[PDB]
Design a protein around this ligand. Sequence first.
Ligand code: CYC
Ligand code: CYC
Ligand code: CYC
Ligand code: CYC
Ligand code: CYC
Ligand code: CYC
Lengths: 49, 160, 160, 160, 160, 160, 161, 161, 161, 161, 161
Amino acid sequence: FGEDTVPYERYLTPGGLQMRSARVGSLREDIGQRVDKEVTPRFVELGQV
Amino acid sequence: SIVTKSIVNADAEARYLSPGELDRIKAFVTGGAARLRIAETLTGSRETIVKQAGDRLFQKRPDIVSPGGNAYGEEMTATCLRDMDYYLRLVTYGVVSGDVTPIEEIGLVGVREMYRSLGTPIEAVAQSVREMKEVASGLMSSDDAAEASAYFDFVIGKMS
Amino acid sequence: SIVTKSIVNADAEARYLSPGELDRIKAFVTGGAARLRIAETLTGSRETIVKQAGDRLFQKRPDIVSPGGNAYGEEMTATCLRDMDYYLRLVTYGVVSGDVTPIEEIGLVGVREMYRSLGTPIEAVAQSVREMKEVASGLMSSDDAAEASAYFDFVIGKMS
Amino acid sequence: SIVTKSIVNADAEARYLSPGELDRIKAFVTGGAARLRIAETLTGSRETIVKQAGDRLFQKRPDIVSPGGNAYGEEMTATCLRDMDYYLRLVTYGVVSGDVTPIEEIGLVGVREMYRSLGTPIEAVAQSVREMKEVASGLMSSDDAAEASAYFDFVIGKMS
Amino acid sequence: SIVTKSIVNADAEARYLSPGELDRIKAFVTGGAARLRIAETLTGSRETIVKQAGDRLFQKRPDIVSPGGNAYGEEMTATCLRDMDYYLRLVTYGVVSGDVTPIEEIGLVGVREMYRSLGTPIEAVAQSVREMKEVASGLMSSDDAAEASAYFDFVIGKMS
Amino acid sequence: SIVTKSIVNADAEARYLSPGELDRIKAFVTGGAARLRIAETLTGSRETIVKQAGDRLFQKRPDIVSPGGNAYGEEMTATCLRDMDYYLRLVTYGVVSGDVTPIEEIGLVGVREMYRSLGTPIEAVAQSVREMKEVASGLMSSDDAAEASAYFDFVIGKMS
Amino acid sequence: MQDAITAVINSADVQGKYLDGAAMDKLKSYFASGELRVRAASVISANAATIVKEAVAKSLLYSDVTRPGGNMYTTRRYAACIRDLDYYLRYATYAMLAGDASILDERVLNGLKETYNSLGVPISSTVQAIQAIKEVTASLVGADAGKEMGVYLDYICSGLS
Amino acid sequence: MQDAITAVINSADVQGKYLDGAAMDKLKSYFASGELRVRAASVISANAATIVKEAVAKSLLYSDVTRPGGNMYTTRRYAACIRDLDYYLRYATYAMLAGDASILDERVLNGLKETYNSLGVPISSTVQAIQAIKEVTASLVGADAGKEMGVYLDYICSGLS
Amino acid sequence: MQDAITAVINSADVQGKYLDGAAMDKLKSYFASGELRVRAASVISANAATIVKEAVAKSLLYSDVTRPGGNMYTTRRYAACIRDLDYYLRYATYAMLAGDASILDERVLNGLKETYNSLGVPISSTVQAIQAIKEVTASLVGADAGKEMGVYLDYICSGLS
Amino acid sequence: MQDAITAVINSADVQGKYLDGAAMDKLKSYFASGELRVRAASVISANAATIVKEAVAKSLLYSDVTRPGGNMYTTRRYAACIRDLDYYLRYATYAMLAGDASILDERVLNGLKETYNSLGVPISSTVQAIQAIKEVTASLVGADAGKEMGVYLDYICSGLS
Amino acid sequence: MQDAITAVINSADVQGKYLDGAAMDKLKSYFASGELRVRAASVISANAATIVKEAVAKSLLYSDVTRPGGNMYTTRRYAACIRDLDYYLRYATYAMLAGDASILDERVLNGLKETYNSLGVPISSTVQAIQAIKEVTASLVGADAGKEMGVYLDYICSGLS
Ligand SMILES: *[C@@H](C)[C@H]1/C(=C/c2[nH]c(/C=C3N=C(/C=C4\NC(=O)C(CC)=C4C)C(C)=C\3CCC(=O)O)c(CCC(=O)O)c2C)NC(=O)[C@@H]1C
Ligand SMILES: *[C@H](C)[C@H]1/C(=C/c2[nH]c(/C=C3N=C(/C=C4\NC(=O)C(CC)=C4C)C(C)=C\3CCC(=O)O)c(CCC(=O)O)c2C)NC(=O)[C@@H]1C
Ligand SMILES: *[C@H](C)[C@H]1/C(=C/c2[nH]c(/C=C3N=C(/C=C4\NC(=O)C(CC)=C4C)C(C)=C\3CCC(=O)O)c(CCC(=O)O)c2C)NC(=O)[C@@H]1C
Ligand SMILES: *[C@H](C)[C@H]1/C(=C/c2[nH]c(/C=C3N=C(/C=C4\NC(=O)C(CC)=C4C)C(C)=C\3CCC(=O)O)c(CCC(=O)O)c2C)NC(=O)[C@@H]1C
Ligand SMILES: *[C@H](C)[C@H]1/C(=C/c2[nH]c(/C=C3N=C(/C=C4\NC(=O)C(CC)=C4C)C(C)=C\3CCC(=O)O)c(CCC(=O)O)c2C)NC(=O)[C@@H]1C
Ligand SMILES: CCC1=C(C)/C(=C/C2=NC(=C\c3[nH]c(/C=C4\NC(=O)[C@H](C)[C@H]4CC)c(C)c3CCC(=O)O)/C(CCC(=O)O)=C2C)NC1=O
């Protein structure tokens, strides 16, 4: 920070980041889980005219 | 539909519909809500019916998905499950219409000649629709399972 | 290892290593060259052992790879061959260590619960390890085949 | 029984029965007429339920009667139907007694060791008693099937 | 409650709750309106039962209000009637809970040591709860009187 | 989104959102239909934009697809077109969100280090994004082109 | 232990047969008497200490056992004796709720005769105490529930003797 | 934090896909609800302190919490609880504007229960104060927007309890 | 532990007052939902293993964690992970039957974060596994009781975080 | 951090005496190895980015980790993975120059498992990435100096274990 | 226990003398036999479940003891019986490796007969079951070690009969 900059939170502990972003909300689908690319099935695609 | 059957009979007779026939559309109208409930149940559970029936069909008849079979590849397996989706949609049409007339008129006349031209085992198609009946009766209530299985047994009888 | 077992048995009764444990460790050291040769030929032929034993397993038990089976499909077949390669690697670890405790600590504790959760027939996994035993025993001398088949039969006993 | 488990809890805590569990025993006594009615209709239909469930079992899993299965032969299928008859008798015993304690202390714990020594597939016999509970729920009334299906599902869970 | 007892026992045995406890839980759930009605009856008559039973105790046993007695003094008698209100509140807790665990965990563990310290006669406390039982049973209907007096005699039995 | 930016600013100020920011959110909410139209046009024409812009890129900079180039070969060219499709997808995300925040979060932070480690010319990636901007601006309406060109030129400026 | 329904279920399981009318008659008898058993158990648990104190007053007090040198003289000994008496009452209540005396002849009478012979406890005096308990319960809870209690209580007497 | 648009974009990005029909349907639903969200945010930003002051009047005042021995006794503790309810209402307004609870999980509920357990703050009383805030906001804002605010305030209650 | 009954009893008891209708309606609501809780618990107890099976298949299988170097690589650690998910499912069934999340932070959550931090267990991966359990049991049981089950599953996740 | 020289000085200093002959032999062994250590450090410091490029192309590229849904998908996460591999290469060069792994114990393995578990970083995939770094470095520098680098790279891997 | 090699050591301990030739030749005979003993023990260790399965299949299967009314009818009784047979096979393996029956005399023949008389276990059924153990082991290994197995199994016959 210079002579004009208010301090701000720059770094976190891993435990603090886990508290912030390991709850049920605000946790991404691809953090600790295999993401299967879901797709419309090929038989439904053939059944679509 | 039974209104279409009665109106065809009355028009070919060149008369008006008898009070017994007016009772036919009357009772059909009263049963319409339950028929719509059964068809909506099948429509909501559409993909699960087709997938489980396909897996159990391929378990009971492994040769059709073996190499050299009619449905070896993934695209041919998709065509199998697509035919199954066609027949499930026809079954829902028959459940809504209250009779087997749309099922017969759309996908049961010339089905033997079509699948003979395609080289497709018609008895295994019948087994597939039987597995569809089993999965639908599994995830449907018993009286509604009997109501759907009437049309399912009509399809099996036309295949066999 | 045998060294670990001897040190643990001495330390449990709080003494230095006994002459019997020294003789056992000396036998372990002298047999180290032969054990290293067995592990070397196993890890050199690790691909053909898994290939031939998987082929013999899938010929003898087609139900696990037929549709409806646990390993039906190319991805599940590759996963089964990966499991067979994992157990062959653990067999090489046990051959190097001179006993069965690395195989026990890595891949034989909770194996029944794991494969029950996976839905895999544990007797068919034991049949796969038995085919690996036969193929590997055909690739060595008689004493080396017996020595490796000791660890293989330990894996058979833990699976069945 | 639920009465003997209540008095086991009572002398485990080393005092007389609580008023809540006394009224609970009263509720069990008043419902025991309905449980005994379920016992009458089940022991009346003790043959047709097990025969239809066995036919459904052989229709679902033809590999039992195929070569490679455990129950190959007329005496083997007779003993399989005898096992299903014993388990149906145990479910009726549990419906009479009000708890899963008689099934547990007759034929439900140690069933893993039982069918491991027999070679019998535990998931296959779980599927067989699942078909038993489906045919039983088909033949019962709604409240009676809801009462018996909890004990049946406990058999499914502890024998899966 | 019985829910807490069953969950605690199943947790100690490291198992799910069986249907033999689940039917007990749902029976306790369904038979709740009578206990609720007794609870609002008791908390409607929460004052007058305490007043009449305190009057009956101090007329039956004047040694409590005798000089040199434990409750000699107006504030001592006020705290005695407050203790009667406490145990009536615990009886309402047990009635609305359907179990003896709230009375046991709040005002039965350490009561003997507590009144052994304070010098208050434990048999006279039991007489006070018995007199509250008689006043409440006179005030309310006979089956509800038996249901409330069940918890009341549990309290006086744990007292003496 | 701009809603996310306004909420983040108001949270940093520890106050409720200013009515100017409410009017900004109101204007974005009303104008989101045009943004959805732009994103729908880009999604529908995602393949022709990538193909034509890749052809114009490879004609303008032949060194990257000549031998010795970073994208020489059919699989490397497919990977380059996959990167262009990725950036067009991020442009659609930014058009939907109404700001450059998802574009910067997903595909601009560390892009210089990533392409420096890969050896890919970042100036030629910027040229590819510029040709994608030109083809998209030719393919949509002029106000839509001016709206999408802000996000496109943001990507141009952050790459350059 | 083994109550009435598990007893008839075990009798059926030994022959390997489903439950028929020859056990279901006793099962209907148990379910007809069940609320009688529960109400009698409620009354006995209500008056449990009073039954013991009237029983020792009418059978055990002012006797040679509570004289010095007797088998009920010291305070620990008297506390142990009344502990045995309401143990017998509570386990008889358990058997009365169960419908069978498996709990009585097993978790009370496993080695009770041998330990009383080793200690020197008078078996006849304990039988008189149990008969006093039976008379108090019969006079306190009724005729049919009283004789249902008396069956298990003189079963305890036969186990002691 | 994420809004509804950011959640849709993140889901499509994790799938590696463009905006399909269902994603555009969710975007259209959020753009339909944005008018009500803006109006509710303006109403709450007007009546910020009023919701809190009759919420503590409904739920907290004239009780043992306010009385000595209670956790909200001193003026410092009262101003602390007023500030906490102001923060809860403002962050619920943030979540109602965004259409997601990501800001609630990131900046409120992270360690909030551990903080209140360390400080001795009554969880049940704080929850009841948030229910009072929910009732006052539902009475003051409307039906659908008040229900949305109630959903996010009940999310705060579930994360705190 | 506390269920809803003991929870409202202690909430009345800490203020020392009797049961009023604003507390009696809580017991009435619990007795309204009790049969739903019993039927959902019976379904989950019947299908306890397959919930974990399809949850691990949905979330954890073929990921980084089962590969060499991952936390559930060896069969011992895989069986420990299945055991942990069985623990979470059984205690969440207990919390759903009780109607109060006391057994979760009283027998699961009070030290499990420290234990997982000491073991190196990925807490976010366990959270995703519990979310997979929630989706599987919501599809299996139904929305109405699946929401109540998911409340305690998110309680377990929030305690783990 | 401690090298071999500071380890010898530490071991003599906590004894309080001067360097005896065994200390001289250890120092001469380190000075003999120092030529190879300096040459290997110079080669790695020159071709620092090429090793990371080859290892990422060998182990991480064209996989599900760098595909959408993986943790190396987003380009900030890709640049973070590149920075982490530069961290491992640079601190392994530091540990090779020191002849000891105290630098890795103090700045590299200090809570790295907790950091990666909180972020969601694949432990198995980063172990394979460090293995690819080990193979590329052993190919670049030689058998002996590559083995010397691989000792500390496997130390970083076993710290990640 | 004590082995065959320690048997002559214990006999010389009782006699207070060194080894004499009448024990030297027996020790040399044990040294000559020990490799086939330890290898046959290895073989039956590898195939240990098959001995129990075939013994149950050809001795106890379809009999009065396993039909209703039998002492091996129920699933618990079957599991206990196959566990007893597995323990019998394991201790017979121990003896045939060790050269002495002291392991059976101490760790099996302590009170097994009296426990079987207490449980009502059919002694003749166990004797024909261990005859089946003899036949399966002699078929698996061969008669050269089959008679050596049958010596200790006849020791089991004499102890249990
Ligand atoms: C008089 C001021 C108090 C009092 C006494 C009282 N006691 C009894 C009866 C009995 N007391 C005992 C106790 C003991 N016997 C022993 O041998 C010993 C240890 C040495 C003790 C502690 C017994 C056994 C009896 C029963 C009579 C018997 O001995 O057989 C009574 C009679 C009560 C009755 O119902 O008969 C009385 C009146 N009671 C008081 O209120 C004063 C405190
Ligand atoms: C092959 C002999 C049999 C078989 C195999 C099969 N395995 C799986 C899936 C998995 N198996 C494991 C087991 C291990 N992981 C380890 O690290 C070790 C020890 C080194 C073992 C033993 C795991 C973890 C999986 C999951 C895959 C993953 O990596 O996450 C399958 C797939 C089942 C599925 O539902 O995906 C199969 C088919 N099946 C057979 O029929 C043969 C008997
Ligand atoms: C039928 C559902 C499946 C199956 C059957 C099968 N059973 C047997 C034989 C036996 N089964 C038992 C089990 C029990 N006996 C009991 O009394 C009880 C408790 C009530 C149980 C659980 C036993 C002991 C036998 C052996 C017969 C005996 O008593 O001697 C067999 C024959 C095994 C063999 O190898 O000969 C079979 C095949 N197998 C299937 O595939 C069906 C799914
Ligand atoms: C095309 C305009 C230019 C070009 C491209 C090129 N890229 C790669 C390799 C990769 N690029 C990425 C980048 C991204 N991943 C993301 O998720 C995003 C944002 C959504 C970006 C921008 C990645 C990950 C790779 C690695 C591929 C993989 O999936 O493993 C290559 C291949 C280089 C190689 O050595 O294989 C190429 C050729 N090259 C050009 O010359 C054009 C300028
Ligand atoms: C009282 C009716 C008569 C009496 C008896 C007497 N009892 C004891 C002490 C004991 N009582 C028991 C009985 C049981 N313990 C149990 O756990 C159970 C099952 C529920 C029973 C039935 C036992 C085992 C003892 C032994 C020691 C003990 O206190 O546990 C004594 C004391 C013996 C001594 O002094 O050591 C006596 C004298 N005597 C009479 O005169 C009454 C008629
Ligand atoms: C020891 C420090 C301390 C303070 C200061 C304190 C203040 C305090 N004043 C209150 C109310 C109040 N205080 C007043 C008093 C006043 N109104 C006027 O007009 C006068 C100017 C003024 C007093 C001179 C009134 C009227 C209320 C009630 C407001 C309401 O209920 O709407 C309340 C809420 C009622 C309750 O106690 O539940 C508190 C907590 N509590 C504390 O523990």
